[PDB]
Design a protein around this ligand. Sequence first.
Ligand code: CLA
Ligand SMILES: CC(/C=C/C=C(C)/C=C/[C@@]12O[C@]1(C)C[C@@H](O)CC2(C)C)=C\C=C\C=C(C)\C=C\C=C(C)\C=C\[C@@]12O[C@]1(C)C[C@@H](O)CC2(C)C
Ligand SMILES: CC(/C=C/C=C(C)/C=C/[C@@]12O[C@]1(C)C[C@@H](O)CC2(C)C)=C\C=C\C=C(C)\C=C\C=C(C)\C=C\[C@@]12O[C@]1(C)C[C@@H](O)CC2(C)C
Ligand SMILES: CC(/C=C/C=C(C)/C=C/[C@@]12O[C@]1(C)C[C@@H](O)CC2(C)C)=C\C=C\C=C(C)\C=C\C=C(C)\C=C\[C@@]12O[C@]1(C)C[C@@H](O)CC2(C)C
Ligand SMILES: CC1=CCCC(C)(C)[C@H]1/C=C/C(C)=C/C=C/C(C)=C/C=C/C=C(C)/C=C/C=C(C)/C=C/C1=C(C)CCCC1(C)C
Lengths: 229, 228, 41, 212
Amino acid sequence: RPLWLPGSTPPAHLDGSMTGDFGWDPLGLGANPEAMTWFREAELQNGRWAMMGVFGILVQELVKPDVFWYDAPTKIDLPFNIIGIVAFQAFAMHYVEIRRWQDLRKPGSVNKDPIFSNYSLPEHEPGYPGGIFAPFVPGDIEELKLKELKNARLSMLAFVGFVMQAQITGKGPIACWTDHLADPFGTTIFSKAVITLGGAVKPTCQIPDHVAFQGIDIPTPCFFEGFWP
Amino acid sequence: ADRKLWAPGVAAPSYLDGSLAGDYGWDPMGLSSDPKALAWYRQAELVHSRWAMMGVVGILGQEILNPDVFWYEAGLPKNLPEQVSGLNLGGILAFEFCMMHYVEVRRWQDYKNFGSVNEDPVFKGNSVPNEVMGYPGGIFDPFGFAKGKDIEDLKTKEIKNGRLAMVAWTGFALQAQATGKGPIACWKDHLADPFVSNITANIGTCVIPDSVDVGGVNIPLYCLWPGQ
Amino acid sequence: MQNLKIYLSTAPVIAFIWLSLLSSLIIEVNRFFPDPLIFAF
Amino acid sequence: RPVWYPGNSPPEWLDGSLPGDYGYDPLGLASDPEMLKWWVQAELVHGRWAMLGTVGMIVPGVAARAGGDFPQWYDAGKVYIENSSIPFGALLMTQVLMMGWSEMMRYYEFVSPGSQGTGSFMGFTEAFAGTGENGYPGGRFFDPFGLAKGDPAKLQEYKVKEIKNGRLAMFSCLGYYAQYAATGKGPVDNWFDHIADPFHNTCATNGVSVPF
Ligand code: CLA
Ligand SMILES: CC(/C=C/C=C(C)/C=C/[C@@]12O[C@]1(C)C[C@@H](O)CC2(C)C)=C\C=C\C=C(C)\C=C\C=C(C)\C=C\[C@@]12O[C@]1(C)C[C@@H](O)CC2(C)C
Ligand SMILES: CC(/C=C/C=C(C)/C=C/[C@@]12O[C@]1(C)C[C@@H](O)CC2(C)C)=C\C=C\C=C(C)\C=C\C=C(C)\C=C\[C@@]12O[C@]1(C)C[C@@H](O)CC2(C)C
Ligand SMILES: CC(/C=C/C=C(C)/C=C/[C@@]12O[C@]1(C)C[C@@H](O)CC2(C)C)=C\C=C\C=C(C)\C=C\C=C(C)\C=C\[C@@]12O[C@]1(C)C[C@@H](O)CC2(C)C
Ligand SMILES: CC1=CCCC(C)(C)[C@H]1/C=C/C(C)=C/C=C/C(C)=C/C=C/C=C(C)/C=C/C=C(C)/C=C/C1=C(C)CCCC1(C)C
């Protein structure tokens, strides 16, 4: 089967089973059937938030107004306080999730609509709630299911780019996009740092600490600068 | 059969037959043994022999065709040509790494298992033919000889020229290091007045700077022997 | 290690080791709490 | 088996299966079978405190190259209680309280492996029950990633790595102490000092290790 490394020899416990299994386990965390099932949800969860997140920042910049994203201040301003939202954020996501988390651990018991009964679906796959969540079904096959991971697993991997780039380069995702294509051999953060024997240069973080928001510290330091190239 | 062994009286080691290319039955360190090591070492001997053969020719090509620019340096963004010089080596090295890291990992995994992936990815309709561990060339030999006609005889000429280079190229690096002269230059000195141009002189001096920095204080140069 | 223990369990050994634990202790009690005639402290 | 000091044979009592067993007991302190399992835990514990200690020394050192104002591992004790805000006694005596709990708990699972997770410590059965080996608790808390649950052939292969990385962390952490007492400078400072002028920064030049 296709693998992450075309000449590789996939680990024993992982063969051709889960959606999109290319045989990648340096550490072999999937050998445990119980925990791998847990991890199986996380990959979707981390993926499905990042995808919707990475598409957020990009749209947040190019079509939208341009402030690379550290912003509390917006042009949707701050309509209802903050502690107003965070109040409603907790109770919202609390119900939303400890609900879905229970369909992971003890499957099917949640399918009923709490108020009245339209239910949902049969028990299906713990991390793929059918029915009301997936009405449209653009592709008709689990080919589309393998098609979902390979997008997300890139986006999660892509998101980390936005952090680090916006650390030292101090610019949004698509700003440095165009900045690279102009004089490409510059701005690789390969050029921009060396650390050979003797000499060590590192670019300094272009975002500062102590960002002022409504009279609050918010230290927000850089991510482990000392070990940067 | 015994071709000719390196020393006149010697016993070719058991694992050394002469099945391989340039075998003289010389492994006095006994280092190659348990052929899983041999396969590995052979790969290096090839890869080294090749980069040397390209290296030796590339050095002669530099100095002959660019009389300035002492060879052993050539690196720092001074000697560089006109279109370059301002490509920011840190971005030049960037361009190299991703290129070599693929090809080398591509070759390494084809040592681990064998005949495993000799096939193109992407288009994935095509492949290099059979070999033994390091003799590809469906693409890598376009011109098709060393196929039907004598093959290992060309393999034999490959090593014996390769080993020559690895030594010859090594001469370059130590000559240019002590003398401060390109290969054909230090050769020209010798032909001029050999007795006083000999290695007898100009030993005990590495005559190399210890900084040689580009965008910083960078790149310590440790020479080879501690000649002052 | 079997037989090294059994020797260390002989009478004179413990007699030495365990008195040297009192002796040391009773010596150092007098280091921090010097000159104790009566129990007054 | 690849013993240390090749050409000899291991001490006859331990040839057995222990992770990282090279047959090194030159004073023969494993000769007591009851005591060996006590040393095997003793090493495992030191190996685990070592590997945390080394990183704890190096990182604040390496952090200090870029600035970022930390102390070296030595005289990081002062710098904290220099700035204090809580007394020294309260801190050291919270140590003995919380820390002594774990150790004196870690002990009675070694003594009798059955208890400690029978229950009736806030529930938590089977998290503390232990996986049956000397220095390996396993479980929910001590093993959050559920590793050492799946393939055992891969597990026994970690248990070897853990020791061999531990024996090196100890033997390095002996260097941090000794090369502090001589050169009086941080571990990464020395790792630069010898990488800069290797010749005059060597061991013989500290003026302590090689007295005259
Ligand atoms: C096989 C045995 C053998 C051995 C062990 C040596 C060993 C040595 N030979 Mg030698 N040689 C041999 C065979 C051998 N040779 C043969 C067969 C020949 C052919 C004729 C030669 C020809 C030869 C020549 C022509 C020279 C040597 C030199 C040297 C010395 C170089 C050491 C060095 O670079 O230190 C590094 C540092 C020094 C030597 C400095 C010592 C000077 C003072 C007293 C010390 C202070 C200086 C400081 C510490 C060094 C750094 C500062 C620097 C800027 C000065 C070394 C002692 C060279 C020499 O005299 O030293 C370079 C030298 O010129 N030899
Ligand atoms: C990269 C990543 C994970 C990478 C993990 C890898 C490679 C792990 C590999 C391994 O495990 C395997 C495979 C197998 C093991 O044998 C080996 C290891 C090595 C253990 C997760 C990121 C995951 C990233 C996540 C979860 C991010 C979520 C949140 C987002 C996107 C929210 C963003 C926003 O809130 C902001 C930031 C600001 C707002 O203005 C806008 C919005 C943008 C939308
Ligand atoms: C000499 C050598 C190896 C010698 C090894 C020997 C004798 C080993 C012998 C033994 O093992 C055996 C046989 C048998 C054992 O029982 C005994 C021992 C003794 C153990 C390798 C050199 C190998 C040398 C090589 C491969 C050199 C490659 C050089 C290149 C690529 C140069 C590139 C450049 O010069 C250009 C092209 C342009 C320049 O401007 C820039 C740069 C980049 C510098
Ligand atoms: C645990 C350990 C280190 C732990 C480090 C810690 C906690 C870190 C502490 C710090 O972070 C803090 C707290 C505060 C920081 O600001 C500073 C420090 C102080 C640094 C080292 C063990 C170090 C232990 C070492 C080095 C032991 C070496 C033992 C050997 C070689 C024994 C060999 C033999 O026993 C055998 C094997 C068999 C016998 O037959 C023969 C003989 C010879 C008897
Ligand atoms: C065969 C031989 C004999 C003698 C020596 C030795 C034994 C070592 C052996 C040598 C082997 C070889 C080939 C060693 C390789 C050496 C070298 C020079 C490797 C490459 C060095 C330099 C590199 C990548 C790039 C440097 C450029 C840097 C940082 C920064 C430049 C820049 C500036 C100045 C600051 C900001 C902007 C930017 C772009 C970052």
